Ligand binder design. Structure first.
Ligand code: ZN
Ligand code: ZN
Ligand code: ZN
Lengths: 277, 49, 48, 48, 94, 148, 310
């Protein structure tokens, strides 16, 4: 196979104070204080590393352990440990699904979003949409976005609102969306720019609204079809005429003209009167 | 024979004097002084995040 | 009520108020360091 | 001296828990042997 | 009564519902067992080798192959260089 | 005395100390170097592992110089144990059946774990999974069972 | 239910042990209870009048698995997992002496209520020990090949009924040091062996959750069985559950792993009672020897229940 490639040498990776934006370093909050509030957020700098999945992937001390999360700093391109990292150093696949309390890196997801909408995210929205802006406004935005927003996962839909320099990338997997957000933030696309890859809000386009509502509905339908027996659900939709005939003949129980209610017929238990389960 | 070995091992594990509370109990021992020296030097002014 | 019922109610109410006094005394002055190394385990039979 | 002897208190003393032994029971405190100057430097830096 | 055999023997009359648990996910009750029982059953499930019938000599043999897979422990009377004592911090080759 | 005396109140060590003095200063300088090892790249609990490792190594050197090779006198051995050149309790565990290769004392302190266990490094390697390179959070031990 | 016996309450708790109660007994008079537990102590309780704890014995280095009142009622007998036996004076509360020589944990022990006084100590080194309660050394010991978990002494004082992990109830002769006959039928380890008050039947509960009554009379057929009783399941703990006979011999009681005491009729076989109230394996279920309908249950939830049968 192949061990995980050390991305940045440990000589360049330290743990130092942020640049001095004040007079006194507050050590409880680890933040500079003093100066003027005209500085405040200042600007978003350029990150110290990008990722090549074909070059930086490998095995760590995490493929041996089931349930290990992906690495935030391998996604950020600045993980020096290589094969000695305790987290996975590979790309999230399509079967890498996670519960609605953590991301793919194991950070805890929150109740609501933050106003400056970034960070880990919230579990009250299955958000697979990433909002990227601050793109150098040219005519070939779509090709370079589709080339560079493609090595992080499998993609459903990229709508490039050109002229504004804004795109909304929807992956099919939420973990891939989180990986792309943590990988492309403060990166460069073709020229020296800082990309503002943040969590997308909700597309007000009613077509997108009904698409998302429908997709939620067949996700829940898939869960219910997994829960219910195959004959039960096959009678439940009733698109098959033979299943309809089976419902008419079976839901009689001797008494004619009954057409037994769904509470009695579609019931599961040891004492139910049905083939049960 | 194997049942006898398992019974003897289980009863010695359960009712031995060395496991009065379920586990082997030792005395609180003294650490090397360089452990505390390294801890105090490492945390420092408590300025690192 | 007779002395039997009176004393039974006295026992019940004074046990409840004694529990309240113990809680109030715990809250009023904490015992300097709040640790307890007599951490006896509790076993639960859980049927899913 | 006379005021110390006149106010010589000796009431009942109940079950007193030692602070350092209760801290030694936990896993958060270890024990070692160091020079008193090193301990004083540590105490001064910790208080600061 | 109501703990006698004829009281526990009689069933509940009437039909059954065609359509309980202490907590929201199941039924949980407080129980009292020895510490050794829980430790032994948790060990039997947890240890890879719980069961699989094995006496002392071939267990010592498996220990011997596992020990020779590991690095050399070193000499404790050698304080520096090659052959210095590494001990329990010797890693397993893989 | 572990407390320093200036020069004229120092008593000389017992005979045979000067033969092993170079290795004792090797261990002392190794520990002093372990004091100045960057913590910027490793977890916090991993910053303290080399000190326990060097304490084990020095105690093992004294222990197997007295008990296996018998190249030092008993008086010298007790002076080394009394003056902090070896950990007497770790040596005492090393003379017991089943604790002969024990990494450190804190890994058998059962009163100070969550479920009153020993460390996972006390477990024989046969009852652990393959490709499981455990590394003790107390000292970095990779397995200190006597059969290992 | 109206009041049946002379108790302060129809059923009531006894608690104060900090460990699993492994054995509880009764006075031959029926007025005192002695219980030994995992916490290496013995608690002595008074049944009648005000139910008061009146004694604690602290001499054993490990769990006390047995304790037996003498023929008179002033001497207590402790078998304990520190590989010892002990005789205790229950007037001064001191220990009279210790009996030493067993090389493993003693599981069972019995004293002779008729004739000369002896001690019957079965232990995991496969050894029955016959002890005199005045000398610290054993009178005799019979060596077997399997750990022994239940012993009983006969009315005649020359027959030893020993049950262990070999799934057989062996009947030995003391003066011959040999088994006179083996008794088969169980398929898990025998936990109790109790002779009937008249001495005509033998009770044996084992770890297969079946309690068997056996014909014990000397002129008996080849199969010395009588009956088998179900309904007392053994749970997760492999404890030494000990049963008892009622004084008239009509009823038998065996503790279960569900916290219940299952009482059958010895002659009919019906499940007469299934008594709940414990949160652990009921280690002992005993009847009052003084003609009373009183049952005492001792269980590993550190507690005993004293109840009356109505
Ligand atoms: Zn250790
Ligand atoms: Zn350890
Ligand atoms: Zn270790």
């Amino acid at each position: 196979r192949r061990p995980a490639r050390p991305q940045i040498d440990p000589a360049l990776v330290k743990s130092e104070r942020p640049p001095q934006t004040g007079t006194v370093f507050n050590i409880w909050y680890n933040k500079w204080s003093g100066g003027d509030r005209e500085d405040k957020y200042l600007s978003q700098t350029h990150a110290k590393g990008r990722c090549n999945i074909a070059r930086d992937s490998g095995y760590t001390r995490a493929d041996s352990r089931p349930g290990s999360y992906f690495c935030l700093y391998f996604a950020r391109g600045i993980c020096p440990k290589g094969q000695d990292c305790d987290y996975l150093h590979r790309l999230p696949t399509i079967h890498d699904i996670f519960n609605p309390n953590v991301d793919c890196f194991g950070r805890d997801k929150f109740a609501d979003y933050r106003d400056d909408m970034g960070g880990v995210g919230s579990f009250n929205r299955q958000n697979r949409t990433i909002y990227v802006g601050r793109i150098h406004v040219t005519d070939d935005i779509e090709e370079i976005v589709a080339r560079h927003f493609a090595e992080w996962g499998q993609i459903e839909r990229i709508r490039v609102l050109n002229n504004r320099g804004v795109a909304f990338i929807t992956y099919t997997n939420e973990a891939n969306a989180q990986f792309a957000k943590e990988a492309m933030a403060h990166q460069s696309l073709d020229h020296n720019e800082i990309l503002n890859v943040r969590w997308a809000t909700a597309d007000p386009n009613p077509l997108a609204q009904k698409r998302e509502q429908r997709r939620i509905e067949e996700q829940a339908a898939e869960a219910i079809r997994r829960a219910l027996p195959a004959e039960f659900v096959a009678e439940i939709e009733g698109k098959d005429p033979e299943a309809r005939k089976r419902r008419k003949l079976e839901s009689s129980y001797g008494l004619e003209g009954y057409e037994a209610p769904d509470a009695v017929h579609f019931a599961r238990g040891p004492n139910a009167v049905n083939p049960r389960g | 024979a194997q049942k006898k070995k398992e019974w003897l091992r289980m009863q010695r594990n359960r009712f031995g004097e060395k496991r009065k509370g379920g586990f082997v109990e030792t005395q609180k021992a003294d650490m090397p002084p360089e452990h505390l020296r390294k801890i105090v030097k490492d945390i420092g002014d408590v300025s690192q995040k | 009520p007779s002395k039997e019922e009176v004393e039974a109610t006295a026992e019940r109410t004074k046990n409840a108020l004694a529990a309240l006094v113990s809680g109030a005394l715990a809250a009023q002055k904490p015992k300097n360091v709040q640790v307890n190394t007599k951490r006896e385990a509790t076993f639960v039979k859980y049927t899913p | 001296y006379v005021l110390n002897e006149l106010h010589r208190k000796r009431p009942k003393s109940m079950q007193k828990q030692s602070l350092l032994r209760t801290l030694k029971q936990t896993k958060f405190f270890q024990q070692t042997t160091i020079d008193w100057v090193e301990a004083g430097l540590q105490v001064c830096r910790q208080g600061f | 009564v109501p703990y006698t055999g004829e009281n526990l023997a009689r069933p509940s009359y009437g039909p059954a519902n065609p359509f309980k648990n202490n907590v929201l996910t199941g039924h949980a009750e407080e129980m009292y067992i020895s510490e050794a029982t829980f430790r032994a059953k948790h060990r039997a499930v947890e240890a890879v080798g719980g069961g699989v019938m094995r006496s002392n000599r071939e267990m010592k043999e498996v220990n011997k192959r596992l020990r020779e897979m590991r690095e050399d422990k070193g000499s404790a009377t050698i304080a520096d260089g090659e052959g210095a004592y590494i001990g329990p911090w010797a890693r397993y080759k893989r | 005395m572990p407390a320093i005396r200036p020069a004229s109140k120092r008593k000389p060590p017992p005979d045979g100390f000067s033969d092993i003095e170079e290795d004792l200063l090797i261990f002392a300088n190794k520990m002093k170097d372990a004091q100045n090892t960057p913590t910027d790249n490793i977890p916090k609990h991993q910053a303290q592992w080399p000190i326990f490792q060097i304490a084990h190594q020095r105690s093992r050197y004294v222990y197997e110089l007295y008990y296996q090779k018998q190249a030092i006198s008993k008086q010298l051995y007790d002076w080394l144990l009394k003056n902090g050149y070896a950990d007497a309790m770790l040596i005492a565990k090393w003379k017991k059946q089943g604790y002969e290769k024990l990494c450190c004392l804190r890994c058998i302190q059962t009163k100070e774990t969550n479920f009153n266990s020993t460390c996972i490094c006390r477990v024989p390697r046969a009852q652990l999974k393959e490709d499981q390179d455990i590394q003790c959070v107390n000292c970095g031990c990779r397995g200190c069972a006597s059969t290992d | 239910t109206p009041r049946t016996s002379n108790l302060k309450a129809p059923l009531m708790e006894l608690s104060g042990h900090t460990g699993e109660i492994f054995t509880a007994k009764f006075d031959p008079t029926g007025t005192l209870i002695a219980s030994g537990s995992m916490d290496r102590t013995i608690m002595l309780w008074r049944v009648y009048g005000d139910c008061e704890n009146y004694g604690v014995l602290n001499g054993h280095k490990a769990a006390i698995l047995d304790l037996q009142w003498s023929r008179d009622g002033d001497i207590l007998f402790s078998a304990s997992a520190d590989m010892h036996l002990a005789s205790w004076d229950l007037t001064t509360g001191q220990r009279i002496r210790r009996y030493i020589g067993h090389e493993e944990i003693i599981n069972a022990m019995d004293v002779t209520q008729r004739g000369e006084e002896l001690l019957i100590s079965g232990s995991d080194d496969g050894t029955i020990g016959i002890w005199d309660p005045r000398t610290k050394n054993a009178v005799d010991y019979i060596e077997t090949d399997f750990p022994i978990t239940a012993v009983a002494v006969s009315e005649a004082g020359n027959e030893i009924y020993s049950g262990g992990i070999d799934n057989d109830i062996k009947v030995w002769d003391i003066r011959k040091k040999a088994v006179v006959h083996t008794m088969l039928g169980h398929n898990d380890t025998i936990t109790t062996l109790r002779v009937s008050p008249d001495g005509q039947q033998l009770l044996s509960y084992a770890m297969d959750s079946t309690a068997r009554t056996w014909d014990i009379r000397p002129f008996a057929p080849t199969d010395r069985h009588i009956r088998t009783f179900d309904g007392a399941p053994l749970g997760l703990e492999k404890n030494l559950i000990r049963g008892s006979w009622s004084k008239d011999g009509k009823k038998i009681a065996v503790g279960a792993g569900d916290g219940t005491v299952v009482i059958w009729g010895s002659d009919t076989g019906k499940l007469l009672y299934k008594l709940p109230g414990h949160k652990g394996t009921v280690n002992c279920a005993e009847f009052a020897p003084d003609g009373a309908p009183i049952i005492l249950s001792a269980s590993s939830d550190r507690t005993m229940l004293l109840g009356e049968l109505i």
